Design a binder for this molecule. Structure first.
Ligand SMILES: Nc1ncnc2c1ncn2[C@@H]1O[C@H](COP(=O)(O)OP(=O)(O)O)[C@@H](O)[C@H]1O
Ligand SMILES: Nc1ncnc2c1ncn2[C@@H]1O[C@H](COP(=O)(O)OP(=O)(O)O)[C@@H](O)[C@H]1O
Ligand SMILES: Nc1ncnc2c1ncn2[C@@H]1O[C@H](COP(=O)(O)OP(=O)(O)O)[C@@H](O)[C@H]1O
Ligand SMILES: [K+]
Ligand SMILES: [K+]
Ligand SMILES: [K+]
Ligand SMILES: [Mg+2]
Ligand SMILES: [Mg+2]
Ligand SMILES: [Mg+2]
Lengths: 513, 513, 513
């Protein structure tokens, strides 16, 4: 270009263009025929993925409005877990549709007040076009999980990953019927092939036992968890022993030895035969533990302590004098193993696991760093279905329905907000358009057939099959999504587009915060 | 912005944007409420105008596609004379409409083949919606001239400039019924006010008479024009006179004096009493001319010689021996005057003037450098009406008619060129839109009323009154234009938009030409 | 200030401010109590003056709009001669009044269309409030001349300069009743005091006679003027004399001597005794001229030849063979003198002088370079009165009348141009305001009394006396001006303000012209 062209567009055109750029970046990642992006560091680190929020999070992005569009992905990441590409593409299409009305000289506030009236209507419509399913229905959960894994390169294992994830999530559904994601532990150990991934009803700990005389395999373990260290106590008032009789050198030392001997006696009297310590164990304590045949690990991290207490039913104890048979957990099998070159301790056959571990395998680290994402997304959508019990039809069959039902809305509205309501309704069809664009299909010929299927039936479901290249019922096909993925997406995108429509100036700030 | 955004748009988006910038530059100059631009040099020269092709000609413009849009104005300048802003605004609106179809993934060749089918249809329609008027009809010529001067700051004198220009142009209509613009001489002498502009049925010459004894006023002049110089001839073979007798110094010198004396005798015997020489006159020749009472000017420029020969009916003579009463022109009054600080020779009351001079007055040089443009445009449109005898209704009442009649066309066409035909028909309404935008009117409310006036009548004429802010018959109002202004505009704009639509790459050249 | 404030004003505010600056520069030079400016070069040259157009012409001025305001002074300089400060002050007050309406969001075209309607009304009013006087009336001419000299530092001699200038101008009134300024020669010879300035009914020539034997004083001179040089003619065909007999060396040389002897014989036979040559005279020709007692000067410049021919009635001759008693001028006294250190030839007591010389004296070159300006302005206003025969009352009594009579106009006009008409009428009172501001008077208290004097009488004349500090009849006081000074001023200022009101953009140009 040239210097003398900075004059030729408003600040709103500036911002709308800076925004459209971000949506144009991620759009080709969408749908089953989507493609991956390669991210490269200054230092030479490399990432390969088609996860949208990850691309938007790792990109070098410098314009303020583009920075404002990245926050549209993160909220979908945080509150739902899947859907971080639909949100940004719809947001940018809303920006670009708004650009088509400002060049006809429509006031920005009129556009904003129209979009506002359209989004609440889309909430009503989404709340009434959905299908209602029970949370105990594991089959549709499998189908939704598979729908989450499709298009991500790790497709070849989806019909196994689905079962694994459905059980994994069904375990951690709490006594109030809610899914917490951090109660599932995801571990990434290389070697073997992606189909060697498996589910552990228990924990994998990044530790090896302290003393090698300690039995390496235990059955029907009695597991004790400690937050206190097995070491000689100090006085928080400062001390000196002052040895005036030579005969009292060995006596002082023997009494320190006995103060550890009694701790080990007490650990034994509880009934334990496996031990975890969140803190240090002395090398003489280790001796008495290996002399009593108790298996012990030390300096275990707090999150692993939480997951052990969850899995076994043990209680973390802060003082050994209170430890009793009431505080001990149970687990059918404990064994140390060597896997992928690392020594690790395995806990298996737990009495009633409230936490579970998923072990992802793979021939390469760049493979596993993607399979982990493909599993996190499925945990998301499964939790959504279990919590809300409402599902919607996939393959963009929802956006066509919404566009039609908002156009039937727009004739009731009069004035000039009607223009913005129509531009909003016409911006949601970017998704089935792009779903055909990526597969190399003819989008303009496809979209008409898709619309026609709806207009003659009230068919909630009909949409594009990107393989046969034909228009099919997406519920009979088994392409299903949870309702929370649409509402959140539209909600985020509308609320973030209105801010860029309400701005008219850009000025400089003096060390803001 | 930022470096890492160069990737995000195609070469076609590049070119379309670089083009839209130019049309956005000149658009606010359009219509009666249009505003002027100030142009500033590197050296400090200044120009103030709202003439479009002048803005586009003097601008520092560096991108190739913007350079390609400037050629849309120059052709309208060259072939018609007026209309250089409608062309560029319509061109950029065509670019921007084309941009709305490429983001739906329509092939560029499909767009080009649609535009092509639309422009020929617009030619048919323009050839059939026009009004047919005779070239002798001076009243409508006045009305068209006034329409050409409206909106240019020099509005206060338009009802005098119209009469002046109509007579000036009617003089130079040749025996084959065609108007040549260079047969009208436009002169720019400061002082007095714009209303002191006047028309001379003759010539103003940038000369003063050679010898001050020569009469300064002559009535019923007999004017002689020479291409040869009145000087002593040289031999194109080289010469020496070789004086061997002292008594032959004065004799050689006297014979050179006689060789000028006889030329002046011969000029007198033709019957002349006023002289113009395209070349030198010797200081002794000047003596004999002032002794015979013949008025003479020397080194007159060739174009002034042409205009004198045209105005008086004299014949430019290359050799004085052939000069006769057959070669002399006639003019009722010749006088030298001092005007605006310059000495000039005035020729008036010509026997049958085939050329005329217009003397533009004004209080400032920046004023006159604009009044000259405002008169050149009216000479243009008057010539167009005199040559073609076809007129069209103004105030954008033509573009609405064309848009409607192309939409009635577009339902006959099937396939995907129909989309491009509609986008073409919807791009011509940029003109009545901008005509309301500049006057501070509400364009979206105005345009509907304007359309309605047409749809119920076949009213060719109805359009915006930018003063009352209301929709009126633009023929009863007297706002008229020549047909050649529309056809050429659309023709140029379509042909120049198709080139930017057919390009897909930009590469570097090795000293092209 | 700071970088981040360039945003905060429009291009029109830019231009209006850049314009107001120029009017603020020159405003304190206005009126009898006005003060002078000092101008300093890069090289060290110095000028001291309060002439406005000179300040505006010599200033380093770089912004385009300020460059556009300088053209308001030059036209008043060129077409009238006096009034170059009223024009610019009124122009800037019009700019600043326009600024007060744009901050209420009035459209620029509305302002321009109001100013236009006001200025034509001011022309009508000025054409009807003036007083009609005959051109033979030398008394009012004296009074106007004195009014032109007041306030310029050279006040002490005004009652002599007035008589000198009135006679000087009355001489050069041509047979058609028009005054040409270049027919008066202004000469600037230092020494003595400003009161030693005098008028010559003839010419002062920057020459001394060629041969010192030539009489230095001649009475009832017979003056011959030549455009040809008194030298041996050459052949424009090239020559060689070829001397084959030694006896023919002196013969060739004697014949060249005789060819000059005969020219001098012929000059004598015409009857001449004083000679001027616009070209060379040979050193032997000088001998024969000093032998015949004829006084001769050579290489006289063309303008001096014109003024001699005008003053004496002689005819400039191009060839000596035609010179006769018909071609000789007459003058009662010719003498060479030494004055101010320069030798000069004086021509006096001319038979019927159509040209006159004014000899300005003074103790310093910076004094005379100002007295010349103070005399040029009076020649201007005297010519204006002699040509038009219409006068107006001074001391700002005209601007108050115009403001009142335009306010009585503004109630007939309806719409929003009424606002601009009022702002125009209220902008003309800047002149009587500044006339009080410079004298250190209280302008707000003065202006009301001045208005009241008009409102109760139709008194055309009442205005400020800047000495007594009181309101008086300016015709009984003898402060009179020619009508052409007001009309031109208002006309220039309105036409130049409308251009800056019609602009809305500033862009860069590519070597304009
Ligand atoms: N078999 C299929 N045919 C067509 N579309 C599908 C199919 N399976 C999934 N999809 C669609 O792919 C989209 C998911 O793409 P994805 O890359 O996950 O985007 P996001 O990250 O925003 O969820 C959903 O809109 C879904 O309807
Ligand atoms: N009284 C009027 N009301 C509305 N439009 C007018 C009027 N007079 C002229 N026009 C319009 O102004 C336009 C001319 O604008 P102009 O600045 O000359 O553009 P161009 O240089 O392209 O001809 C024409 O389209 C004409 O119809
Ligand atoms: N005795 C006086 N009292 C008040 N005003 C006067 C008097 N004599 C002249 N003037 C005013 O001085 C003004 C001339 O000022 P001047 O510096 O010549 O400005 P300009 O160069 O624009 O003519 C005139 O408006 C005239 O009316
Ligand atoms: K994907
Ligand atoms: K215009
Ligand atoms: K002064
Ligand atoms: Mg997804
Ligand atoms: Mg035009
Ligand atoms: Mg003055």
């Amino acid at each position: 270009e040239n210097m003398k062209r900075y004059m030729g567009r408003d600040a709103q055109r500036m911002n709308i263009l800076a925004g459209r750029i971000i949506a144009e970046t991620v759009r080709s990642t969408l749908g089953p025929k989507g493609m991956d992006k390669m991210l490269v560091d200054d230092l030479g680190d490399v990432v390969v993925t088609n996860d949208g929020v990850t691309i938007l999070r790792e990109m070098s992005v410098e314009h303020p409005a583009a920075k404002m569009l990245i926050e549209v992905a993160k909220t979908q990441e945080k509150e739902v877990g899947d859907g971080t590409t639909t949100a940004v593409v719809v947001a940018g299409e809303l920006l670009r549709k708004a650009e088509e009305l400002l060049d006809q000289n429509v006031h920005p506030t009129i556009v904003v007040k129209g979009y506002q009236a359209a989004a609440q209507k889309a909430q009503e419509l989404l709340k009434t076009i959905a299908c209602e399913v029970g949370a105990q229905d594991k089959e549709i959960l499998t189908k939704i999980a598979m729908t989450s894994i499709t298009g991500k390169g790790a497709e070849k294992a989806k019909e196994k990953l689905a079962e694994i994830i459905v059980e994994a999530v069904s375990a951690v559904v709490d006594d109030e019927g809610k899914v917490d994601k951090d109660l599932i532990k995801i571990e990434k150990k290389s070697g073997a092939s992606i189909d060697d991934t498996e589910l552990i009803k228990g924990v994998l700990v990044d530790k090896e036992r302290v003393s090698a005389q300690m039995p390496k395999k235990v059955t029907d373990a009695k597991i004790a968890l400690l937050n206190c260290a097995i070491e000689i106590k100090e006085t928080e008032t400062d001390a000196e022993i002052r040895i005036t009789d030579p005969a009292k050198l060995m006596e002082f030392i023997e009494q320190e030895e006995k103060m550890l001997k009694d701790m080990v006696a007490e650990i034994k009297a509880s009934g334990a035969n496996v031990l975890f310590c969140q803190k240090g164990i002395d090398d003489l304590a280790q001796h008495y533990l290996a002399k009593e045949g108790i298996v012990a690990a030390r300096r275990v991290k707090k999150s692993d302590m939480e997951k052990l207490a969850k899995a076994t039913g043990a209680n973390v104890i802060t003082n050994i004098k209170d430890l009793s048979a009431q505080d001990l957990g149970d687990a059918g099998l404990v064994e140390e193993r060597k896997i992928s070159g690392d020594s690790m301790i395995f806990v298996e056959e737990c009495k009633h696991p409230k936490a579970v571990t998923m072990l992802i395998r793979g021939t390469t680290e760049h493979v596993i760093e993607e399979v982990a994402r493909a599993v996190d997304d499925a945990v998301g959508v499964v939790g959504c279905t279990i919590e809300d019990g409402r599902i919607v039809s996939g393959g963009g069959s929802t956006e066509v329905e919404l566009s039609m039902k908002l156009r039937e809305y727009a004739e009731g509205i009069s004035g000039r907000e009607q223009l913005a309501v129509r531009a909003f309704a016409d911006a949601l069809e970017v998704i089935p358009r792009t779903l055909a664009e990526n597969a190399g299909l003819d989008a303009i010929e496809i979209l008409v057939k898709v619309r026609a299927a709806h207009a003659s039936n009230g068919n909630k479901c009909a949409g594009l099959n990107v393989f046969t290249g034909a228009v099919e019922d997406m519920c009979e096909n088994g392409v299903v999504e949870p309702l929370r993925v649409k509402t959140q997406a539209i909600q985020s995108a509308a609320e973030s587009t209105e801010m860029l429509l309400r701005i008219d100036d850009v000025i400089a700030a003096e060390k803001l915060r």
